[PDB]
Design an enzyme around this catalytic site. Structure first.
Site, PDB file in Angstrom:
ATOM      1  N   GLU A 186       0.588  -1.318  -0.122  1.00 17.16           N
ATOM      2  CA  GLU A 186       0.085   0.007   0.117  1.00 17.16           C
ATOM      3  C   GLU A 186       0.802   1.369  -0.066  1.00 17.16           C
ATOM      4  O   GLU A 186       0.716   2.150   0.622  1.00 17.16           O
ATOM      5  CB  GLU A 186      -0.845   0.055   1.179  1.00 17.16           C
ATOM      6  N   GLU A 286      -6.156  -8.139   0.015  1.00 16.73           N
ATOM      7  CA  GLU A 286      -6.781  -7.703   1.035  1.00 16.73           C
ATOM      8  C   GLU A 286      -8.413  -7.452   0.858  1.00 16.73           C
ATOM      9  O   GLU A 286      -8.601  -6.704  -0.061  1.00 16.73           O
ATOM     10  CB  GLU A 286      -6.246  -6.530   1.897  1.00 16.73           C
TER      11      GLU A 286
END
Ligand SMILES: O[C@H]1[C@H](O)[C@@H](O)CN2CC[C@H](O)[C@H]12
Length: 394
Positions: A186, A286
């Protein structure tokens, strides 16, 4: 060790193990509270280790590393029909900056986990979850509220750590277990220089292939729109064995939280349709069952929840208290959760598969695969559907 064209990843993240996250293991942060005052609770692993000192931090972490995830968890993961785990690890496990407060020792357990994976026929991605300076300012990068990964020598230090990971886990020794090395979890696209992030991804890709490794390189989408990475690291340029990791949630803004259950499902189905159009293999690395941001400290230590209008200037939607304990959930919330899980599973199996965040939490049920499975909200077997074909995929 994996066929990204024909096999579907059905996995769980092993979060909260090598990178501490206050919302996942609140018991390690709660002792710092003074009554109801949270002003002195360390907000991330950097400050937690700094406040405790090297000796106490290592004593407490050794106990955590040796009990949070063990061989029994790998057997249970396999028994539930999962075939894969994603393992977050921070840069400090391999290299410390001068004056870093972090302690090391995580590699011994990472290596034990690779053997447990092998024994249980589970495949793995190793994910560099925190880079020096922080690539996103989240507490799960190790250092909250700092955005300095592209400043100074931090990008170079990250490449040095990746080179270490490449030489140890991208070679022949673990070629039957490791099916991807994720270069950086991320990176926050909007606050970074994207041209420099692409150069870092390319340098990581070339460095791994230069070692003779054939291991797949996993790049996170950096919060860009679907299709953004279609023209990067392509077969036309001789770049191969590349996977894009998309993370998908609907709880980090007031607008997402206020959607009714049908619109939450429509959005989940659309994730499947749009990922199908991309030109690289892709996996939902995720996602979770959360329909609220109520878990204590999910937004960070000393920050409230948008769901109850206590953070980010969001409007009150509902009280979080009644949703903290799965035994107190209404029949409607249970049904909504099951519908949401099934739509997401269908959408992610439409492309490369899915990796739920996360395997376990101390007490946040929306984020625990174990808790949801034991309460009958996560399908078991995972192909079971109480709400079949909500998306209508062809
Ligand atoms: O726990 C973190 C994880 O460490 C990050 O990769 C971001 N994830 C997004 C949802 C939740 O914040 C989760």
């Amino acid at each position: 060790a994996w066929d990204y064209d024909n096999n579907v990843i059905r996995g769980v993240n092993l979060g909260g193990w090598f990178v501490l996250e206050p919302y996942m293991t609140p018991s390690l942060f709660e002792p710092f509270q003074n009554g109801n005052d949270q002003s002195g609770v360390p907000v991330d692993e950097y400050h937690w280790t700094q406040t405790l000192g090297k000796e106490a931090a290592l004593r407490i972490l050794q106990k955590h590393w040796s009990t949070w995830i063990t061989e029994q968890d790998f057997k249970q993961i396999s028994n539930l029909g999962l075939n894969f785990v994603r393992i977050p690890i921070g840069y400090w496990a391999f290299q410390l900056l001068d004056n870093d407060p972090y302690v090391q020792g995580q590699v011994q357990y990472l290596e034990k986990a690779l053997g447990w994976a092998r024994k249980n026929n589970i495949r793995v991605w190793i994910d560099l979850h925190g880079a020096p300076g922080s690539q996103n300012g989240f507490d799960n990068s190790g250092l909250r509220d700092s955005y300095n990964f592209q400043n100074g020598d931090n990008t170079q230090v990250t490449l040095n750590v990746l080179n270490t990971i490449f030489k140890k886990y991208g070679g022949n020794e673990y070629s039957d277990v490791v099916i991807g090395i994720e270069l950086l979890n991320e990176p926050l696209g909007p606050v970074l220089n994207m041209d420099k992030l692409k150069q870092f991804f390319l340098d990581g890709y070339n460095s791994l292939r230069q070692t003779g490794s054939v291991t797949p390189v996993i790049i996170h989408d950096a919060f860009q729109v679907f299709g953004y990475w279609n023209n990067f690291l392509t077969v036309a340029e001789g770049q191969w064995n590349v996977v894009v990791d998309h993370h998908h949630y609907q709880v980090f803004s007031g607008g997402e939280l206020s959607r009714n259950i049908n619109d939450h499902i429509s959005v989940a189905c659309n994730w499947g349709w749009d990922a199908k159009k991309e030109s690289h293999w892709n996996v939902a690395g995720e996602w979770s069952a959360a329909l609220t941001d109520c878990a204590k400290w999910l937004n960070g230590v000393n920050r409230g929840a948008r769901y109850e209008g206590a953070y980010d200037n969001a409007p009150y939607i509902g009280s979080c208290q009644p949703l903290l304990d799965i035994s107190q959930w209404s029949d409607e919330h249970k049904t909504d959760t099951r519908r949401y899980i099934e739509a997401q599973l269908d959408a992610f199996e439409y492309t490369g598969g899915w990796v739920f965040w996360s395997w376990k939490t101390e007490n946040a049920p929306e984020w625990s695969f174990q808790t949801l499975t034991y309460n009958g909200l996560f399908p078991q077997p995972v192909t079971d559907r109480q709400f079949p074909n909500q998306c209508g995929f062809h």
